[model samples]
Target: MLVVPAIDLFRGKVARMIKGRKENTIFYEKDPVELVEKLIEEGFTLIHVVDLSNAIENSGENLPVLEKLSEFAEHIQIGGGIRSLDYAEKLRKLGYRRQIVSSKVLEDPSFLKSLREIDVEPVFSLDTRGGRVAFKGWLAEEEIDPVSLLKRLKEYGLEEIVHTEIEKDGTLQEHDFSLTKKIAIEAEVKVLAAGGISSENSLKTAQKVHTETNGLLKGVIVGRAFLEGILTVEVMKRYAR
Candidate 1:
């Protein structure tokens, strides 16, 4: 399991948002590139980055900043407004071997069939809020049962899923561990649970879920927990540092 820290970008700034809303956005003063380097020094091997400006809107405004991260590209899994061939190629050129793709598949339907040509390990986002699967960067919602779709996605080789409970995102509150357990076990894929991860309780709960699910609980995606002194490299090492 990996303790991945999320570094969201909005208009070239490193930030975090509440429930994916711009009004609740929080910015960090550190440069995006420097932040990645700092996380590396803190023993974090994988970085989770999302382009907020691109996802919420349609502009790839932060790609230039993201592209400049080629040196640590392999360690990242970038997402947000990554629905086009040109954008995927740009990501690949910089060595971003993994991408978190959502939205386009729902709209095009045949998009998943072209997965082989894309050349990146794709992780589907099973973002949900009040029982509906979200897309369009979680700004839109549809009443799709995630497990049913995930069962179908399994046939498409959707090997991993990031199941986020929208209401809990960025709150730094307690996570509903059983929610991920149900998804991981029923859907039969490695699932990384994300939401409000306050402290090691989230990671410790994730471990229990992992053990109970026979390793299907991938890990927890934490953001505000790290920002507010709830989790540190020393603490995450108890699971994955």
Candidate 2:
């Protein structure tokens, strides 16, 4: 399991929002590069970044910071407003290892299909809030079950999934164990449970779900936990092993 730190970009600034709301955000440092460097020094190998502004506005605004971090981490998986071929190529040129795609994976199946032609691996995100697949950074809801969506994408040879529960994100609340456990067993691919990761207890709960399902709980993506001091880079790096 790998511990990946999340950096959500809002108006070119790094921020963390609860349930993916702008009003509920807790802004972190202004310099994303400085934060990335510190995390690198702290021994974090993978970085998870999201362009919240882009996801909502449908524009690529944080391309510059992403370009900068690509040089340091072993792999950086990015998502948010990544719908066009041109944007995908731009990130590839920046040396991003994987594209964590959402929205279009279900809205535009052809775009997801087209990923097979690209060199980078794709990790489809299933952002669910209130049992519905939410889109636009979890601000809106969709009419589909994530399990059915995953089964549909099985033939795409996707690398993994970042399943997030909108209700628990950044709330220091517990994760949706039943939801995660369901995806882990129902799908034949690796699943990284996202959202509601606020404590060691949540981590242990996710671990137990993984063990019971006999599925790949790749790892948890922590955002509020780090900012709130519930998790430190040192502790995360140690757990990654």
Candidate 3:
């Protein structure tokens, strides 16, 4: 299974928001391009970059650095603030492999259709809180069942989905990977599990889904665990490779 590292951009640096709370934001004192370049040099392939300023405030302050990131890696997927066709196209022009469409898809299911018509690939973000999909940067929780949403997206020819358990995101507590396995087996798409990767056991549990699903579960994404030194770069390759 592959291991992807996420660098959340707030203003001009890397930020990690614990459970989507603004009060709990932890900003890393490194340049976005520098951090991403280092990750790529260290053998990371698919970089997950989130533009918090754009996603949360629509400021688009980090777009320039994201353009710089495109110079380093070819598999970088960007999430946050990709809410419209033109914006997606703007990001598409910048060379993002995938533009993440989350909350907007709920009210505008047709956006997924629009995404397919564009050149850049789109990956659905199944951000969940207590099993229901959470949106608006995880500030708003919807009544929708994540599995049903998976089925709906599959109808639109969805190829990949990023499933994140919000409460476990950045907390580094034990995560119940059964949810990810359930989606992986059901969606039958490339499922990248995110959130709550604290220890090796948790990583193995996620990898088991990949084996159980005959490679449908592609990999897992680690944020706090990797950034906080709980899951090191060397440790990640053990299972990731």
In the range 22-141, model 1's lDDT, one tens digit per residue, is 888888887998888988877777788998888887877897898888788888888897787777777887898788887876665355556547677777777876656765543544
- Worst 10-residue lDDT window, candidate 2: 134-143
Model 3 per-residue lDDT tens digits across residues 1-241: 8898887898878898876787888888778887777888788888788899998888978877877877863678899878889998888777775887777777677788888788667788887767777766445444477787788877777778898887885454666788888877776777888878778888888888789988878888888888888888888878867
Highest TM-score model number = 3
Worst 10 residues of 3 by lDDT: 134-143
TM-scores for every predicted model: 0.89, 0.86, 0.91
The whole-model lDDT of each prediction reads 0.78, 0.74, 0.80
Which scores higher on TM-score, 1 or 2? 1
Report lDDT (Cα) of residue 160, candidate 2.
Answer: 80
* Clashing pairs for predicted structure model 1, backbone only: none
Clashes of each: 0, 0, 0
- Number of the top lDDT candidate: 3
Candidate 2 runs further than 4 Å off: 23-26, 58-61, 130-132, 136-143, 170-172, 213-215
Instruction: State the local distance difference test value for candidate 1.
Output: 0.78
lDDT of 2 by residue, 1-241 (tens): 6678888887678887766566777777669888888887777777788888788776556766776777863567888878777777777777875788876766676776676576767788878766667765435445377777677787666558888887785454678778877777777668787788877777777767777867577778887777667787667776776
Which segments of candidate 1 are over 4 A away from where they belong?
130-143, 170-172
Question: Which has the better TM-score: candidate 2, or candidate 3?
Answer: 3
